Amino acid sequence: VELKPSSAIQRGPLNKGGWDAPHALHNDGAIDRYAHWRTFYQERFKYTRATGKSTLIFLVAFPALIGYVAYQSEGLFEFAGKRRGESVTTRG
Amino acid sequence: IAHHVDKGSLYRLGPVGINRLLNKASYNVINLSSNTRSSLSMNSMLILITIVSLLLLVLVMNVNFIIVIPVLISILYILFS
Amino acid sequence: MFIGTIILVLSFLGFVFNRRNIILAFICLETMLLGINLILLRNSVLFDDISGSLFAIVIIILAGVESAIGLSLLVSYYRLRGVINSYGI
Amino acid sequence: ALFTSLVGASGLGFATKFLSNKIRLKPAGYYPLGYVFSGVAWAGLGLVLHNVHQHSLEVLEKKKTAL
Amino acid sequence: MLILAIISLITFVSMSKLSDNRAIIRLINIYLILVLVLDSFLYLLFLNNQTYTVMGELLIFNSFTFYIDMLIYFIMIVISSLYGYNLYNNNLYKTLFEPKKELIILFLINILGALLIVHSNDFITLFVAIELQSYSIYLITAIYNSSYKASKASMLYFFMGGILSILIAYSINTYYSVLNSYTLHSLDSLIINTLDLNLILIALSLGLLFKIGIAPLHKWLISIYENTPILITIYISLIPKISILSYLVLSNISINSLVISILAILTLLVGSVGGLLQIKIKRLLAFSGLTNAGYMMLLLLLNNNEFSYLYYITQYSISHLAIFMIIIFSIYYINYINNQYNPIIYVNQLKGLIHDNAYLVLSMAIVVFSFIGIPPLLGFFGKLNILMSILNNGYYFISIVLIVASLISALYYLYLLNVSIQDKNNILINSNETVSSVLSYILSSLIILITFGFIYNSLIIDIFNVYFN
Amino acid sequence: FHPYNTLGLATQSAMVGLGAGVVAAAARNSLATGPRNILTTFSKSGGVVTIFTGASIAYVFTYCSAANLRERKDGWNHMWAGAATGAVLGARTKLVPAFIGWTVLCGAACGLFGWTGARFNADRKASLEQSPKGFVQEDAHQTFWEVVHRRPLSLTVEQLGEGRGINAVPIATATEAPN
Amino acid sequence: MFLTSILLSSLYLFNRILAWQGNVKHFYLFASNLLLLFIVVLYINFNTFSNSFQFNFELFNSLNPFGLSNSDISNGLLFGIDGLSLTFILLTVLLIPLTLLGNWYNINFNSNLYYTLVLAIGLVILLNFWALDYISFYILFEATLPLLFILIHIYGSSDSERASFYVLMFTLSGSLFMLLSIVVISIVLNTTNFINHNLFVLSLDLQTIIWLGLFIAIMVKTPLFPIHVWLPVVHSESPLAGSMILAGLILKLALYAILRLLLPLLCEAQILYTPMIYIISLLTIILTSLATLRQIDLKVIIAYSSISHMGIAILGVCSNTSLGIYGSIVLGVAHGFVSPALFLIVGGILYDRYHIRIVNYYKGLTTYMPQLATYIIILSFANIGTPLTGNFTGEFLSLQGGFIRNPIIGGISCISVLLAAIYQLKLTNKLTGGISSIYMHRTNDVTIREKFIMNILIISTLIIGICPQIMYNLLYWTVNNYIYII
Ligand SMILES: CCCCCCCCCCCCCCCCCC(=O)OC[C@H](COP(=O)(O)OCCN)OC(=O)CCCCCCCCCCCCCCCCC
Ligand SMILES: CCCCCCCCCCCCCCCCCC(=O)OC[C@H](COP(=O)(O)OCCN)OC(=O)CCCCCCCCCCCCCCCCC
Ligand SMILES: CCCCCCCCCCCCCCCCCC(=O)OC[C@H](COP(=O)(O)OCCN)OC(=O)CCCCCCCCCCCCCCCCC
Ligand SMILES: CCCCCCCCCCCC(=O)OC[C@H](COP(=O)(O)OCC[N+](C)(C)C)OC(=O)CCCCCCCCCCC
Ligand SMILES: CCCCCCCCCCCCO[C@H]1O[C@H](CO)[C@@H](O[C@H]2O[C@@H](CO)[C@H](O)[C@H](O)[C@@H]2O)[C@H](O)[C@H]1O
Ligand SMILES: CCCCCCCCCCCCO[C@H]1O[C@H](CO)[C@@H](O[C@H]2O[C@@H](CO)[C@H](O)[C@H](O)[C@@H]2O)[C@H](O)[C@H]1O
Ligand SMILES: CCCCCCCCCCCCO[C@H]1O[C@H](CO)[C@@H](O[C@H]2O[C@@H](CO)[C@H](O)[C@H](O)[C@@H]2O)[C@H](O)[C@H]1O
Ligand SMILES: CCCCCCCCCCCCO[C@H]1O[C@H](CO)[C@@H](O[C@H]2O[C@@H](CO)[C@H](O)[C@H](O)[C@@H]2O)[C@H](O)[C@H]1O
Secondary structure (H helix, E strand, C coil), rough: CCCCCCCCCCCECCCCCCCCCCCCEECCCCHHHHHHHHCCHHHCCCCCCCCHHHHHHHHHHHHHHHHHHHHHCCCCCEEEECCCCCCCCCCC | CCEEEEEEEEECHHHHEEEEEHHHHHHHHHHHCCCCCCCHHHHHHHHHHHHHHHHHHHHHHHHHCCHHHHHHHHHHHHHCC | CCCHHHHHHHHHHHHCCCCCHHHHHHHHHHHHHHHHHHHHHHHHHCCCCCCCHHHHHHHHHHHHHHHHHHHHHEEEEEHCCCCCCCCCC | HHCCCCCCHHHHHHHHHHHHHHHCCCCCCCCCCCHHHHHHHHHHHHHHHHHHHHHHHHHHHHHHCCC | CCHHHHHHHHHHHHHCCCCHHHHHHHHHHHHHHHHHCCCCCHHHHHHHCCEECCCCCEEEEEEHHHHHHHHHHHHHHHHHHHHHCCCCCHHHHHCCCCCCCCCCHHHHHHHHHHHHHCEECEEHHHHHHHHHHHHHHHHHHCCCCCCHHHHHHHHHHHHHHHHHHHHHHHHHHHHHHHHHEEEECCCCCHHHHHHHCCCHHHHHHHHHHHHHCCCCHHHHHHHHHCCHHHHHHHHHHCHHHHHHHHHHEEEECCCCCHHHHHHHHHHHHHHHHHCCCCCCCCHHHHHHHHHHHHHHHHHHHHCCHHHHHHHHHHHHHHHHHHHHHHHHHHHCCCCCCCCCCCCCCEHHHCCCHHCCCCCCHHHHHHHHHHHHHCCCCCHHHHHHHHHHHHHHCCCCCCHHHHHHHHHHHHHHHHHHHHHCCCCCCCCCECCCCCHHHHHEEEHHHHHHHHHHHHHHHHHHHHHHHHHHC | CCCCHHHHHHHHHHHHHHHHHHHHHHHHHCCCCCCCCCCCCHHHCCHHHHHHHHHHHHHHHHHHHHHHHCCCCCCCHHHHHHHHHHHHHHHCCCCCHHHHHHHHHHHHHHHHHHHCCEEEECCCCCCCCCCCCEEECCCCCCCEEEEEECHHHHHHHHHCCCEEEEECCHHHHHHHCCC | CHHHHHHHHHHHHHHHHHHCCCCCHHHHHHHHHHHHHHHHHHHCCCCCCCCCCCCEEEEEECCCCCCCCCCCCCEEEEEEEEEHHHHHHHHHHHHHHHHHHHHCCCCCCHHHHHHHHHHHHHHHHHHHHHEEEHHHHHHCCHHHHHHHHHHHHCCCCCHHHHHHHHHHHHHHHHHHHHHHHHHHHHHHHHHCCCCCCCCCCCCCCHHHHHHHHHHHHHHHHCCCCCCCCCCHHHHCCCCHHHHHHHHHHHHHHHHHHHHHHHHCCHHHHHHHHHHHHHHHHHHHHHCCCCCCCCCCHHHHHHHHHHHHHHHHHHHHHCCCHHHHHHHHHHHHEEEEEEEEHHHHHHHHHHHHHHHHCCCHHHCCCCCCCCCHHHHHHHHHHHCCCCCHHHHHHHHHHHHHHHHHHHHHHHHHHHHHHHHHHHHHHHHHHHHHHCCCCCCCCCCCCCCCHHHHHHHHHHHHHHHHHHHHHHHHCCCHHHHHHHCCCC
16 A cells, blocks of 8 residues: 555645725835835844944933933922922922 | 844743754754764663762752752753753 | 673673674563562562562563563564574564 | 533533544534533533532531431 | 453454454453443442452452443544544545554554553563553554654664663563562561662653653653644544552552652643643643643652542543544645645644534543533533642642642633634535534533533542441 | 852862753753763863853852952852853953843843752741731831831831931921920 | 523524515614614613712622522622713714624625624623623623624635634634733632722732732733734725624723722722833824834724724823723723724725725826725814814813822823824825825725714714713713722
8 A cells, every 4th residue: 555645535725815906006116025025024023233332322221211200209299289388298 | 122122132031942942952962872873871870870860969959059059050051961 | 789780781782783693682572571570579578568579479470471471473474484583674 | 500510511521422423523413412412421420520519519518417 | 351352353353454454443342331231230349448359369359440440431422433434535634634444453452551551560570561561552653654743753662762671671681689578568667667669669650650641751752742643643642651650559659759749730730831832732731631640640649649640631531532522523624735634733733623613623622621620510510629639748848839730720721712702704605515423423422521510529428438438 | 157168069060060061961961862972071062061061160269259258148249259250251252232231231131040048948937927017016126027007207217318308306386386 | 481482583583584585784784773762762761979899790690590690699690881981882872883883785695694793793892891800891892803704704805814813813812811810819818899999998019919910911911012903904905894783882991990900999909000001192192103104005094093092092091080990981982982983984985985995096086986084084083083073072181180199191192182293194195185086096085874874973972072071871880990099
């Protein structure tokens, strides 16, 4: 016995049955290449002196600034209905 | 932002870096039992190495724990790097 | 205790570092069982206990059956290949 | 309730018969007596589980009564 | 019943032709079904977790072991159905899947060894049963002697199991040298905290565990599972694991071991990572079994682990049988038969199965997402109960490793589904051959169990609370 | 706390790493493929001895130093030790971003390992099972795993701090007209 | 009569309909509208003067697994609705039929599987809003990922494989930490139910640990910076029904999860941790908006737009102010109206005509496609928060709450009002503006179906923007149930 699939299996092509509509878009190629580049930038990214700058800014420094501000300003301000001479701060 | 953070570092700590990390770790894991010439001597050596390494590691942790930690880190490095 | 540990350890090393034969692997397994049985029987004598000798005679029987089955498996391997080489099990 | 459990177990049996017929690449009503046989079989399993559970609860209640 | 079956089948097979072995398998399958139906009322003996010692004090019978035995009968029923019923009545499927004459006898003897492992209370019984399992499963790996790969695997498995059995015997005889006993009932609080005894006990545990592929000793068994026939792999990858892990769970031997924790972490990481570059199906499933063995190693450190282990081993057995059955069913649609023994090897041969059989791919999806542990399926509740136990007992780093392994394993579990739901040219339109009714029903029943067993979890817990507490 | 002896533990560290590197070099020599001898154990080893020794020295030195600088025993010391060990393992690849990533990621990993208790095992007297659990009975101090229907307000104010809603007296009673 | 008789009648009718007409979409749309009507009847029969849970029912009990429980020992899954649940339930039943009708004519291969998966995801989300324990919530929170994987993989765009793997793996990653949290809760309390879980006061040092897992899940599902990168890919490469469902309901499941799992329990951990939430939310707002300003794909732009508004909603819900909670809920509802309309425009109108989403091809739709331009302008100015739309009401009140809680962060977060306008109008101006593109031929304007969908979604947001107060009869308890002030 030569091990081959069953002869009973009749096979045919995959036909998704869509109505082929006319060409509504004339693809450009340059735009498509620009789009592929800008969509799959993630696979070509490399750490350099320019990229690491933005990383250590936006993922280290700016969160640290916001966090210092947030944890110092935690329960500092309470100025509902406050009046002249009354302190709007709870602490010093 | 869009290219160095959102499509850079956050994909590296993400789908790209994990993919490369796991490619290398998988390749190192499967290219460990190196020689298909003889499957018996190799795995026999693995039994020997496992028993010896375990005995010495249990000695080391009885002596003091924190010394065994970098030994295990280096073993993972040898197995997965 | 000493003779058995020595035979066991040397048989294990001669199993692990065998780049020569398959017969040496069989021999090292059998000598390992021998070493265990000798430690077992020395403890049987010192404690004046029968459970050790019972376990020992059971090991004799089981090792015989192990040898029979292993040397049937080798014969199947040789049925197909015709030569049992230095390597490749 | 018993009747609910038997109905649901028979539904699981119908699902098994259906999925069997579909794995076989047959229509879903290929041999409709198999639905009846699967129903009674899975309902018997469900009845067994129901009785085991009821005896378990009776045991844990007899313990309280004897306490 | 098993020994009656063995002593009956030996005679009846000796006095029968090779044309009768399939019908013999059918007969003994119905025998096992009748046993599991009529004799399963013995669960009432174990009410309120009453435990019995039998054959002197050589065997132990409780609810745990009764359940594992029912499970092993169920597994043997499925595996015998795969040998006793032809998928298709073609010459191909009469060339690929034929039972050999002695295969059923060896299966039943291996089942006997499995159960005498789980029921063991003395180490002499454990050793005799370990050897009765391992010799029989050597011969099961070797019975298809017209395969080069299978003979090679037979011999590797013989030698490695022999060495690990030497280790088990050394552990047992050292335990005897120290305590003058072969029984673990001889241990208590006082003996544990008065004698340093962990080297012997962990040596026993590792000699038993490396026989099921615990890292770093996994490659040999994965090669054996790859190189064996598919219908032999389905057995030899499951039943030894159940037996040995059930013994090690019933025997509370490694309650807070550091070595077992380390090796379990290693098993998880290896079984998750190494399966990512596997292109073959059986190696992928072997690494899946490895990581599940790691999940079950974790509950050897608990001292209250019956529910988690029983749930997880039952669901893993059902999923394992289902996925191997789906790979067996997919051979009708693969376009290239690789061997007489492993007709399907590579995962990309499953490409386009949804266009030939869509509900087979639904089954595959259910099983894959149970392996991943997606609710409301059964693997999710398994993982949940394991996590519950290990976090109740203080394993917090192992839990994060468990999550990470659950995530990394999903990739190679999803490889199968992804390629299966891809598009293919040259689809199937008609076929006059139909697959078996019985095997189709068995697979559908397993899938329905995976899908709808969560309905009964309340009832199962209420029964457990009476028979195991 | 009790201070750590840095140089002694690190010398033990270095000797242990050296022995482990020798064992790994021997294992590599015996498992390898090509023609090899007793010469090649240190010639053809891929820096295994230096890996083990450097990792061991770095981890133990940094751990004990941070424990003596911080004057504490906690998981941040394991974070620093992992940072140092990763720096050693990443200096092998002669690249800056890989070095930084190795440092940061193994720092995070070993710091998680220390956060969880610095153990692959369990404590087993701090676990939930062996510890007092459930509802606490009569005004007793709530332990870690215990549950309470109603907590003390002084405790809340100390744990959280005054401000942002949370005050030592409720607002309505504190602004109730003394009538 | 019987229960089984009635559902067997429905089942037999479904089988015969499928036999005669080989499609399921008509029956599923009938069931869609029937479920909407039943939920409206439940709202008619809903008491607004009780904070309790109503229409309770229990499933998978020991005594009746295939039925409802009346037991004195409850071991199954609990279900029941509060006003908070009912709001999002109304949204869900409103949106499901529109997601089915948005893909009525553009699925020409294996249609029935598409419609089954869509309706199944919708019903899982409905049941998830009906849940009243951690485990039923979880098993309905994670049960969408198989269906979404299959839907996106089979019926998705070019990069559909990557999106399928993302929507499963990212969500599973967060949800497994949620599972660790839930496991800890269950072993410590020995109970999982959303009715009396504010009575159990855990210790602070354990609250602070449970909160971490729940918040990692909420960060991956909301999404929030730095774990927001899956959302552009998934929302872009999915079929239209998937994107609509996702952006409208699955993102709001995280908001509901905060309010239902994390605030009532874990009050002290939350009141200690919320400045970190504010850090993450402000980052998620500003950096995601600026990242939107340099995207070239339309559906991707709308996808990024969802994230900033969900960050504003997080500011509101983590504010410990009644106005902030109400604003976050109104944001969820109004975004669930408006964002699927934008997704329809950019994934079912334009994508169905041109099969491309790169901005460089699109220009001057106003000339041949004027109705579409009117819709684009309306929905853009609604998405950026123009008054008399619920988007503004929600943004306004969420930022009020954020300012009350932290004036500095809550005040800096008000540049959302600008950046939204920038990234939305930079797209609208190009699409509607200029001479019509030379890369595009002329095609039909919007149809009656597309217009029906967009008009429903515009009427709803204009109603809740002109009188937001109509949603208060189901929320005047919820705006005070999750506030920790002594
Ligand atoms: C008791 C304390 C124990 C605590 C644990 C301590 C951890 C010790 C870890 C050391 C063990 C060795 C494992 C090292 C990783 C293996 C692969 C490797 O060497 O990393 C390099 C890899 C390279 O990518 P590339 O540069 O493109 O390829 C050229 C490489 N020569 O790298 C990359 O692909 C890029 C990496 C980018 C960063 C990705 C970070 C993802 C973080 C989530 C990780 C989850 C997966 C964990 C996998 C487990 C693997 C063991
Ligand atoms: C099977 C093949 C046939 C060949 C067999 C060869 C003989 C068998 C040797 C023994 C059996 C093999 C054991 C396998 C290794 C694993 C052993 C193990 O894991 O047990 C360790 C156990 C402690 O671990 P655990 O209980 O999990 O954690 C709780 C700690 N309180 O228990 C312990 O604490 C162990 C006690 C520590 C002492 C270990 C002794 C090692 C001493 C070596 C010193 C050598 C001198 C220095 C270096 C020389 C090199 C030049
Ligand atoms: C001489 C003087 C002695 C002085 C006394 C003190 C000495 C201390 C000695 C400690 C033990 C050192 C043992 C070193 C490991 C054994 C050598 C080795 O190389 O192991 C790997 C081995 C071969 O690998 P190789 O052939 O070189 O090829 C690699 C390509 N991937 O192939 C193998 O598979 C064998 C594996 C053995 C592994 C043993 C178990 C290690 C446990 C892993 C820990 C993981 C835990 C970390 C968890 C973190 C989770 C993120
Ligand atoms: C038992 C055959 C196993 C073969 C595999 C089939 C699973 C059967 C499950 C019944 C278990 C039982 O009902 O029992 C509950 C057992 C202990 O109860 P018991 O002492 O064994 O008494 C049972 C008496 N019987 C034999 C007469 C029935 O608790 C457990 O931890 C069971 C955990 C298994 C979880 C898997 C659930 C699968 C969904 C079931 C949908 C019907
Ligand atoms: C460009 C990529 C590289 C940049 C990545 C930056 C990631 C941040 C890593 C720096 C980690 C240093 O983090 C530091 O924080 C803790 C507290 O917060 C310090 O330790 C301090 O902790 C407090 C608790 O908060 C202790 O009770 C004690 O007061 C101690 O002084 C440690 O000395 C150090 O671990
Ligand atoms: C991949 C993503 C990873 C992010 C997920 C992070 C979750 C990690 C779990 C963090 C919580 C662990 O919780 C932690 O809390 C307590 C302090 O409260 C620690 O405190 C305890 O440490 C141990 C070690 O000395 C001792 O018991 C000590 O007396 C103390 O009680 C525990 O060692 C640890 O259990
Ligand atoms: C991602 C979220 C899920 C992470 C997975 C882990 C969840 C479980 C968290 C770890 C629990 C750690 O909890 C452990 O530490 C706490 C201290 O904080 C200890 O609690 C004990 O601390 C001691 C101080 O050392 C005090 O006396 C205190 O009254 C209590 O008895 C316990 O020894 C133990 O309960
Ligand atoms: C999968 C599709 C998604 C569907 C999701 C929508 C589900 C909607 C279900 C809402 C209806 C629940 O309504 C529920 O009312 C009461 C609770 O007081 C339940 O409980 C009622 O049981 C009956 C018992 O005979 C009695 O009337 C009892 O006094 C009680 O009122 C009902 O059994 C249930 O019908």
